[PDB]
């Protein structure tokens, strides 16, 4: 069910038993996951979040990021709490109103405080566009091609276990997915299609944790979007997803009419699928209402490796094409022991006050800003690289930039730079020991935008930290609410 | 489950899943449908409903109307708010206290506060009977023989729609069913039957929109009651049932043992049966636990036609057999413009004021009443006719009549009237354009009766009017008590 | 999923549907069952219970006891409503902080409230022996291997009525089966074994009434451990369990890979396993996804009887071999008439102050507590006895004593006594008219301790008395934290 662009979100707690087994949640929109909130390029989106939240297992506060979404000009309706607002407290609400100028794409939101989103508040976000450049190459672009690859706990979030060493007890595809131990006979989803047509599935990973290995039985899959790039055209025959990415592909469903296997494997917890775990179903219109009794190709041939995507757009590289060839050039120390991360020896821990406040109560530097060692400035309209070079445990982390997509100039497990045409996104795996995975992008945009591993018991454990971009020009850049300076003298009185 | 005639009725928010898809309910007794309210003819019925109620999205107020039951001398008990009181706010508790004098049959409750029952509060209400002129004709006549046909909707009814045309997205009876769209292999309600038994089928429409065409695979069905009036034995295949509706049928288990597919086909939403949508089992105590694979006859050849129906006493008719031949003969305008639907040039809009309040207050007449042109006053013993010639979209409206039941002088599709036995009843569609669906009854009963289209979704907006049955005599007919005094004060001050 | 020693354990309502009927219930930790709650012998528990209950349907108190659990210095935390506390009020925590020294093995947890453990807050408790003497019976003895048997209605339990005659609508094992009535095809628990290997399997009856016979096909169970008594190993084929008791048994893994149902009936409600009813299933790794086909042996050749159960350690028995041969012999006439149970003609009605705090604010006797007639006074240091003779209204009886085990001198259906090597336990059924089931212990706890039936519907009835365990030193014994004194003026206030 789609909403809005104008739209009414309330947050309730609700037990749900995707997998058969009832555990309490968090829920955005009263489902699981969250009603798909939607609209088209350039659309004002007035989100108003009625937090209802009664359940403290889970915290009864709550905030929303909107994943992918720039936020220029808006940078208070971001959602990280402590970066850029305090959480809503319980029986109040937050109107989330901001624009989307020149994006359009697959998005999802989801609660953005501590462990949240895994205990329930995710859900798909989309921005069509009427004259999207890839929209003739397929027939149905609407909610039942969003494809939802959740990791689902019988543990509640709170009582994790960090870090950790956290796995997920199932996989549900489109909210549904039977359990990885004593695997009961639960309802499985299904994706219907009819013969000829072509179909923008747009897969959307709202992982607290595992990267999948997603494939469909007898069946190829062309990108054709990631992270909301749109991309040359790639077909592949199984795409790993990590947690938060994005991918619009065309499925032509040009295969006999009958039931095949949907396969989303994680990298930890339930290996294969046996009793149907990790699985959900495509079927044919007219195929007999049964299970598929398909198998995956014993080797998979045209997987997915992101240095054989490019964007459909012209983006080039900003800077220079050589190791270092930008202005300020990054490069992050990421390390693990004792039970928490660091970025360039410092765990993050959210500040008292949140630094869009800081910022916006003074702070000219940089140096003002707490926590200490945690924010880092970048300065306004400058090519920025940063290389996040892999070893941490563990591991592949997806990293995310708020704020910002960029270009991946150096991929996972392949050490050859790309300086001409690499895919632009907004979360990439960092790979593994040895790797030296790096990024570029352009300042235009100022204020505080979160960089954080998005396995989100590592993000628990600090895995993060500030680019606190155009400080000078964050107040001027973002006029903030009324509503929103509200937020943190509620939240302090409550706490 | 039942209860009462004296009974607590708590009105709960909880998430359900009768589909498979979780999404916020509002549940009267904490179950979909509510529990069965039960009790024997005469009985004072004492029903003590808790609000309990958070969840916004869905309404915290509530008022539940008792569908089918006169009412005579509690006119505050009806439950239509605005019309006989105003709502139960929330953390507030209301004793509806009323009696069901000369009343038996299959009954109904639901809340009757905007489109609230579609989001639940729907539940099964009946009277039994010591002497029911029918109890020979069947065995088995309790709670696991009523048959609840319910549409069930994916989006919130305060997010609808609206009007707009509004489709449910499943079909439920005993509240369970599978989805319209990638229909997952959800659980399906069982009914049981043992070999040489005759069962009472109790056959009620919750539903808020849709009609249905009941029937059960390789089985007769004997209608023996219709909304609450016992009826000629009529022996049909098929049961068309609009919203609101109930029948009371014989089922002969006399078939083969095995498992028989019962069908609910709405009249908008999911066509068909494939992977057993609009779908429950009826099986013999014997049979193989497996899925029916009946199929339901080519063409059904003893549909059940309601001039076919004909009381089971000798009810006669009110007047005069001819048109017009009666004290107090109404012809209704009944039309749709720009998303709302008028009765007489006026959409109803409820009034700040009670309806019963305004009368209680000092009101005489329908032009001294609130909405203005929404009222039409009749006087005491008379017979009324009323014609509702059809044609407004978007039939075919199953218009409905509180604290009566009426002759159907002329029913749906046919244009000869019937002044000699025509059928009883207190929710008749209108039919079609041409046709001229007329009703009469008698005015013994003061108070003030709403008339409506019992689509919730056309009540919404605006598809009725009141009648004011004796307005001078209301107050000292209907003896308030000070709970019900108490509602609007206390509502009135929370909003 | 176990939680604690220290943890807390939240208490919520949530509809669940584990037989398919959506319905409320009150929750602990948020699943059904409740979490495992575990810890090692001597290990301090610190269970902080927030109570968060908003449904006024089942009592938005609450009071938890950790059955069998002796609670010696800790009276205060042992949960009885009326006996050792007042009920915590919505919106309030408590800590119920204490130690298992001497103890290990399997107990269970539930609400001691009216007969609110029935709506759902029932959990296992395991105390793990890191030198358990058991060890090398078995290869596997974790989460995976609890199973609990669950009786679960469709009524909610402040609505049975009462007693009155009352029946569950279906049986659950490890949270899932299926209902009685109108069995649908909702998904069954699956225990999941390996070829060669050793489970100990920990059966818990969280049972609010029914006794189960319980098996497993082409299978026998080696008992080890009674109501956390080590035992002799004794293999049966089948085992009776009776309510709140508790057997660990070793399942050797040995038969053809395959699935074998896993069998329990009711001594009341659903007779046989017809669509799946008292069954879940044993699935070997290897095996077919599908429903066991199995068949339960004709005649079941070694089913458990309790006189051939015999303590592990050389417990033996207090005081002399003959009836009378202890220091406080006692003799208890039990009676049902006209819906109440009385102990000695009196019908236990829970006071209004606490037994506990009525000692505490200086009561010295029997004779000053409240209840008149439902306190019988013990000195400490002695041997008792206590003769509980059969013949009250159904029956068979599970009779309980809280903060202690004790020898069964005299098992049910057989008037031997046994006064060298009886097993001990906790919960022990008093059999049948004639029977005289008769049970010894020394006093060594000081503190009032609650002996009742534990069908929980036969509590509500008044099946129960307190032994006021050594009154003169009660108090000195069991010093109370500030929070314990403060649940009765809460309690009170908000009355
Ligand atoms: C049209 O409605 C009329 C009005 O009731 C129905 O008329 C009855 O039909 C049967 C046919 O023999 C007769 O027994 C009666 O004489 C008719 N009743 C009266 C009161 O005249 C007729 O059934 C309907 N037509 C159709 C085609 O269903
Ligand atoms: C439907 O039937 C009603 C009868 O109650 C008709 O009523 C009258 O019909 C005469 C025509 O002979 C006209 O004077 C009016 O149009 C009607 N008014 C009254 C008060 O009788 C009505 O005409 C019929 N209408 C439709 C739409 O079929
Ligand atoms: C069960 O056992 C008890 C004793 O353990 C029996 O109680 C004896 O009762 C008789 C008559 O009631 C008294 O004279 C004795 O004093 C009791 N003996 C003792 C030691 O107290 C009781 O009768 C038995 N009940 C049965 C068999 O129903
Ligand atoms: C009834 O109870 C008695 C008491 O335990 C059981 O008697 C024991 O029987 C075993 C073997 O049959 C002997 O080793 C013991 O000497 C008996 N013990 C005592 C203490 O007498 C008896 O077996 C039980 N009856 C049944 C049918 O099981
Ligand atoms: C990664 O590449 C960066 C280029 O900015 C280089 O400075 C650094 O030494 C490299 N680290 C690793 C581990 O390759
Ligand atoms: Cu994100
Ligand atoms: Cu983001
Ligand atoms: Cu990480
Ligand atoms: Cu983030
Ligand atoms: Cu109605
Ligand atoms: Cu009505
Ligand atoms: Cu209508
Ligand atoms: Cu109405
Ligand atoms: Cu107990
Ligand atoms: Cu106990
Ligand atoms: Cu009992
Ligand atoms: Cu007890």
Redesign the interface.
Known sequence: ?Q?GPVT?L?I???????D?????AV?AG???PGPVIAGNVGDNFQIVT?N?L????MLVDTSIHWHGEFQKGTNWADGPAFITQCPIIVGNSFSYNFNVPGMAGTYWYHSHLTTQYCDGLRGPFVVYDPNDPDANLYDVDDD?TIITLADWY???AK?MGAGGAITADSTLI???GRTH????????????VEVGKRYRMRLVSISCDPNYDFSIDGHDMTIIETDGVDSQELTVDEIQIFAAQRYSFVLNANQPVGNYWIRANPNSGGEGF???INSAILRYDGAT?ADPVTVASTVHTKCLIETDLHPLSRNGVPGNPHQGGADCNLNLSLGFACGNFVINGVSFTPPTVPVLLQICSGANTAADLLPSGSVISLPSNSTIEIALPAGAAGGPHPFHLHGHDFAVSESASNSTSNYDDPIWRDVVSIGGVGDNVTIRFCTDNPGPWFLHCHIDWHLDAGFAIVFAEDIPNTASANPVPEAWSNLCPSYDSAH
Chains 1, 2, 3 share one sequence.
Do not use: K
């Open positions: 069910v909403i009414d309330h309730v707690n609700a037990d749900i038993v995707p058969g087994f009832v555990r309490p829920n009263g489902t699981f009625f209802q009664i359940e403290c297992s039942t019988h543990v509640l009582e489109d909210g549904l131990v004593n695997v009961a006979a639960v309802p499985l989803s299904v994706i219907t046996d009793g149907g209402t």
